[PDB]
């Protein structure tokens, strides 16, 4: 399996740059076949207090790494969805301000941009410098509210509008395509594979 996987890995490298930009952004996921199925770990919520995304995010953060410490456990595959920020823009409200979705995308790109850290005293340094220290700054949105405060510039009146004005900002499953229900309730499931020998 290793030889075939490395062969296909090397071969598919050639066209990596010829696929659509959107496709390349997600990234291709090559994976060998899995043999050694033990069981599944399923967090079902009978009371419906939590949804699939929350349970998946609990399992991944707290139990997925935690379970791998079992001797004789090789790998774990998580079925479920990981939370991601979603910005459901109202089209009519965009029309009211004379803005489009592309403007919202540009605003998201501009406001949420990382800053390159530096180091004061980094060589080259003028003779006489005796101190060197890292200097850092943050420019990335990191919470629901702050993403709501992303500024947008109106055209008709020129006013500055939060992003909540022409959109609803929330956190939801990255991909809504699939869903899992256990006993009619939200669920997520992790499967276990052997370690060799």
Q: Which of residues 90-149 bind another protein (CB under 8 A)?
A: 90-92, 95, 98, 100-105, 108-127, 129-143, 146-147, 149
Task: Decide whether 157 or 183 has the Cβ nearer to another protein.
Answer: 157
The contacts of residue 74 (CB under 8 Å, 6+ apart) are 36, 193, 194, 195, 196
Q: Of 18, 25, 33, 39, which one interacts with another protein (CB under 8 A)?
A: 25
Rounded to a whole number of angstroms, the minimum distance from the CB of residue 9 to another protein is 7
For residues 30-89, which are near another protein according to CB under 8 A? 30-32, 61, 65, 68, 73-75, 82-89
Task: Decide whether 49 or 140 has the Cβ nearer to another protein.
Answer: 140
Rounded to a whole number of angstroms, the minimum distance from the CB of residue 135 to another protein is 5
User: In angstroms, rounded to a whole number, what is the distance separating the alpha carbons of residues 3 and 15?
Assistant: 20
Residue appearing with tokens 């050694």: 36
Give me the DSSP letters along 56-103.
HHHIIIIIIHHHTTSTTEEEEEEES--EEEEEEE-HHHHHHHT--HHH
Count of residues binding another protein (CB under 8 A)?
86
| Residue of 63, 163, 45 lying closest to 105 (CA atoms) | 163
| Residue of 113, 115, 119 lying closest to 135 (CA atoms) | 119
196 binds another protein (CB under 8 A): yes
Rounded to a whole number of angstroms, the minimum distance from the CB of residue 84 to another protein is 4
Rounded to a whole number of angstroms, the minimum distance from the CB of residue 19 to another protein is 13
């Amino acid at each position: 399996v290793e030889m075939a996987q490395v062969d296909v890995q090397n071969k598919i490298k050639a066209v990596e740059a010829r696929l659509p930009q959107v496709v390349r952004q997600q990234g291709l996921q090559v994976e060998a076949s899995s043999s050694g199925f033990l069981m599944l770990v399923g967090i079902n919520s009978p009371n419906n207090q939590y949804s699939e995304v929350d349970l998946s995010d609990y399992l991944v953060r707290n139990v997925v790494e935690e379970l791998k410490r079992v001797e004789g456990v090789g790998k774990v595959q998580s079925f479920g969805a990981e939370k991601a920020m979603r910005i459901w823009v109202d089209p009519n409200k965009l029309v009211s301000y004379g803005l489009s979705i592309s403007d919202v995308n540009n605003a998201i790109r501009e406001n949420n941009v990382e800053i390159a850290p530096g180091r004061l005293g980094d060589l080259p340094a003028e003779k006489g410098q005796l101190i060197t220290i890292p200097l850092s700054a943050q420019g990335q949105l990191s919470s629901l509210e702050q993403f709501k405060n992303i500024s947008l510039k109106s055209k008709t009146n020129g006013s500055v509008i939060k992003l909540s004005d022409v959109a609803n900002v929330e956190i939801g499953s990255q991909a809504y395509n699939f869903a899992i229900l256990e006993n009619g309730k939200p669920a997520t499931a992790a499967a276990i594979q052997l370690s060799p020998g």
